[PDB]
Amino acid sequence: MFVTMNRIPVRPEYAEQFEEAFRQRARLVDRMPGFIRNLVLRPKNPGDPYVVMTLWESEEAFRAWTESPAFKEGHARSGTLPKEAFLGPNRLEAFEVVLDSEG
Amino acid sequence: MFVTMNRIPVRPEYAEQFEEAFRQRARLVDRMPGFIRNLVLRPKNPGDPYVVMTLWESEEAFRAWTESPAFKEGHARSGTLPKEAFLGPNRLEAFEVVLDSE
Numbered sequence: 001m002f003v004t005m006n007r008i009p010v011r012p013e014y015a016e017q018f019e020e021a022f023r024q025r026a027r028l029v030d031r032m033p034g035f036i037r038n039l040v041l042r043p044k045n046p047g048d049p050y051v052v053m054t055l056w057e058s059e060e061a062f063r064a065w066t067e068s069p070a071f072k073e074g075h076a077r078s079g080t081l082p083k084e085a086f087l088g089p090n091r092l093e094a095f096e097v098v099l100d101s102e103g
Numbered sequence: 104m105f106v107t108m109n110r111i112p113v114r115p116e117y118a119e120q121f122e123e124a125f126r127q128r129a130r131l132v133d134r135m136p137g138f139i140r141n142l143v144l145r146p147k148n149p150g151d152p153y154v155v156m157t158l159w160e161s162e163e164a165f166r167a168w169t170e171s172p173a174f175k176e177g178h179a180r181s182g183t184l185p186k187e188a189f190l191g192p193n194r195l196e197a198f199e200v201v202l203d204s205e
């Protein structure tokens with residue numbers, strides 16, 4: 001299982017719009033081959049970034065997704081969010097799951 | 104749902120020791136009230152930190168956990184086991200789940 005964490009430093013003033021916009025992105029990724037789960041995570045402290053965490057069957061499944069028309073439409077999101085909404089660029093992290101309490 | 108992520112900047116030479124030691128104690132949390140799931144995530148770049156991610160029914164369930172005998176007992180069979188194998192300190196980030204495809 002392959003996981004991405006997209007750290008998005010959205011200002012608290014725009015948190016609701018960000019969430020509303022990202023609800024749509026989760027919709028477009030649902031039918032995606034190898035998609036497992038998406039979570040949007042609000043930070044305890046508003047000065048820290050949101051995390052969009054996405055679970056995939058494999059890195060390859062993620063790569064296919066990045067090249068898809070669904071991904072491009074999903075990005076029509078913070079297309080609508082002004083540049084000013086963010087403190088900085090997003091920071092994308094990626095991982096392989098080494099232990100999972102589930103089965 | 105409440106999520107913690109503990110970012111562990113283990114050096115690559117000690118990553119195998121970290122993983123295997125965490126495995127030894129990872130089960131201690133399972134019986135805890137409000138525990139949902141735990142994942143240990145290895146970075147794609149060995150220069151980046153591991154993330155230990157845990158899903159909780161509430162923030163108070165997490166907090167109660169950190170007081171438990173099982174937490175103290177487990178943070179000796181991994182919290183002590185590896186030497187100084189780190190680029191710096193752990194960094195705990197906490198979150199509320201606001202969207203879940205599940």
Ligand SMILES: [Zn+2]
Nearest residue numbers: 059060063064
């Ligand atoms: Zn490929």
Ligand SMILES: [Zn+2]
Nearest residue numbers: 060063064067
């Ligand atoms: Zn390719």
Ligand SMILES: [Zn+2]
Nearest residue numbers: 059060063064
């Ligand atoms: Zn490739």
Ligand SMILES: [Zn+2]
Nearest residue numbers: 060063064067
């Ligand atoms: Zn490809």
Ligand SMILES: [Zn+2]
Nearest residue numbers: 063064066067
């Ligand atoms: Zn391609």
Ligand SMILES: [Zn+2]
Nearest residue numbers: 006075090092
């Ligand atoms: Zn993106």
Ligand SMILES: [Zn+2]
Nearest residue numbers: 109155177178
């Ligand atoms: Zn711990």
